[PDB]
Amino acid sequence: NVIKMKSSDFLKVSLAFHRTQGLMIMKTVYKGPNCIEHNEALLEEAKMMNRLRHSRVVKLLGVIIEEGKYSLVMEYMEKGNLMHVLKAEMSTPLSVKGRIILEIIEGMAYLHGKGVIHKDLKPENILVDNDFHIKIADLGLASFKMWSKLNNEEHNELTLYYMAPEHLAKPTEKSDVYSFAVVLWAIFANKEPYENAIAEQQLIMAIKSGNRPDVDDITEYCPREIISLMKLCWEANPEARPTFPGIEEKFRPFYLSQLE
Numbered sequence: 436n437v438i439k440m441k442s443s444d445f446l447k448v449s450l451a452f453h454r455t456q457g458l459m460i461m462k463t464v465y466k467g468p469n470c471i472e473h474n475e476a477l478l479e480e481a482k483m484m485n486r487l488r489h490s491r492v493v494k495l496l497g498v499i500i501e502e503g504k505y506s507l508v509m510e511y512m513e514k515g516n517l518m519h520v521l522k523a524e525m526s527t528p529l530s531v532k533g534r535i536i537l538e539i540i541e542g543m544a545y546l547h548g549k550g551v552i553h554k555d556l557k558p559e560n561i562l563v564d565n566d567f568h569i570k571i572a573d574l575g576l577a578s579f580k581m582w583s584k585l586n587n588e589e590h591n592e593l594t595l596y597y598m599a600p601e602h603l604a605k606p607t608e609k610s611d612v613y614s615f616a617v618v619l620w621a622i623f624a625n626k627e628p629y630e631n632a633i634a635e636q637q638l639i640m641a642i643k644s645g646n647r648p649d650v651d652d653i654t655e656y657c658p659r660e661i662i663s664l665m666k667l668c669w670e671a672n673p674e675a676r677p678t679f680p681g682i683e684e685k686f687r688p689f690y691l692s693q694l695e
């Protein structure tokens with residue numbers, strides 16, 4: 436269950452140290468006066484997000500709901516996010532990349548099975564622990580309706596590359612599948628796509644017209660099956676994209692057979 440934490444247990448987004456539980460990431464969403472009577476709804480949204488419990492989905496450890504201060508507290512993932520890892524000094528072996536992909540699939544299938552559409556899947560929202568195991572997060576608060584509203588409330592002192600072309604429409608599971616296709620490409624390219632795009636409006640129109648990440652710009656070995664999977668997952672028509680359970684059933688035997 437979500438802990439009701441107190442500031443007095445701790446010494447923007449910042450690393451934090453709970454005086455008995457240790458390292459944690461804190462996002463303070465609001466700091467101001469008590470202009471807010473969303474208290475019940477803010478806490479309940481936190482409880483709802485905290486009920487999404489899966490090994491590949493981040494844990495919201497606590498919430499701070501105090502007089503003029505509203506904070507979320509999340510486990511610390513010491514390797515940072517997925518793009519940070521892909522660009523690190525030593526490369527990441529193909530068997531670890533394949534396991535990362537499988538864990539992303541499992542986490543996303545869990546979320547969809549609970550009726551949750553992520554809407555902002557991207558390497559920045561894939562967090563990595565020291566063992567190169569991953570957790571899906573929502574660091575832009577696309578799923579924290581109430582906390583996102585509080586973040587831009589009046590009395591408060593405080594990405595395109597992965598978006599399905601229909602949204603450049605009500606996000607669906609298939610919107611997430613498109614985002615996953617581009618994450619697949621980035622995992623093997625070890626970088627963000629579309630580096631040669633000049634202008635944002637150029638990129639939007641190109642993607643809406645059928646432009647996709649440059650498969651030829653992947654320099655290391657990428658299995659043909661993974662190339663085929665990313666192309667299926669970024670099909671223009673969302674109804675042509677598979678589901679994450681359909682992806683898992685194709686990818687898991689391949690992972691066991693050739694990547695593990």
Ligand SMILES: C[C@@H]1CCc2n[nH]c(C(=O)N[C@H]3COc4ccccc4N(C)C3=O)c2C1
Pocket residue numbers: 448460461462484485487492493494495496507508509553571572573574575576
């Ligand atoms: C898809 C996942 C479902 C379950 C879940 N539980 N917690 C989060 C989350 O992303 N929590 C961040 C949200 O706000 C932040 C933004 C930036 C940095 C840290 C946080 N913190 C503290 C969180 O708890 C999630 C998403």
